[PDB]
Design a protein around this ligand. Structure first.
Ligand code: GDP
Ligand code: MG
Length: 158
């Protein structure tokens, strides 16, 4: 059975912790500060027969060490959060081998009426650095099951 390590990256306030809490426990709160009550949480999967042990890491070399995939999140309502995405890529590449499966993720899509990131622009940067781009809303639970499933499959292929 497959054992994968996945790290969450990006600026504060974008929804990194909400994403892990939503995926792993189906909880979401916008009333107080959320903090992961562990270094990582475990999720088990079955993909076309085979089992997958997933360890999802969050933070408020030990962190980067032994990672197979990476989830780099920005906030669709906030252009600075996106423009800082490139700093994290040019830190992920310093820490780890360019063999790691990277996701770039536009979170908070329930707030579309307040969008400030260009979809074209975001998807273009993703392709140029070899990664895939995804849209999520932790609040409404949209796009998240698909993000983790596709990442798991990508890590299985290489
Ligand atoms: N409307 C909306 N709010 C969100 C979403 N995801 C997170 N939030 C809220 O944005 C705030 C920051 O979230 P947090 O998970 O702590 O971001 P982090 O610093 O990257 O870990 C919290 O109030 C969340 O409840 C979303 O998809 N939609
Ligand atoms: Mg957090």
């Amino acid at each position: 059975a497959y054992s994968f390590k996945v790290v969450l990256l990006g600026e504060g306030c974008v929804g990194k912790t909400s994403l892990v809490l939503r995926y792993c426990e189906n909880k979401f709160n916008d009333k107080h500060i959320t903090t992961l009550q562990a270094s990582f949480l475990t999720k088990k999967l079955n993909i076309g027969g085979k089992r997958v042990n997933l360890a999802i890491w969050d933070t408020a070399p030990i962190y980067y060490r032994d990672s197979n995939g990476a989830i780099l999140v920005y906030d669709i309502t906030d252009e600075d959060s996106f423009q800082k995405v490139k700093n994290w890529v040019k830190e992920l590449r310093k820490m780890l081998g360019n063999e790691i499966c990277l996701c770039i993720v536009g979170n908070k899509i329930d707030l579309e009426k307040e969008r400030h990131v260009s979809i074209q622009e975001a998807e273009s940067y993703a392709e140029s650095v070899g990664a895939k781009h995804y849209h999520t809303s932790a609040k409404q639970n949209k796009g998240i099951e698909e993000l983790f499933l596709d990442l798991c499959k990508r890590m299985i292929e290489t």
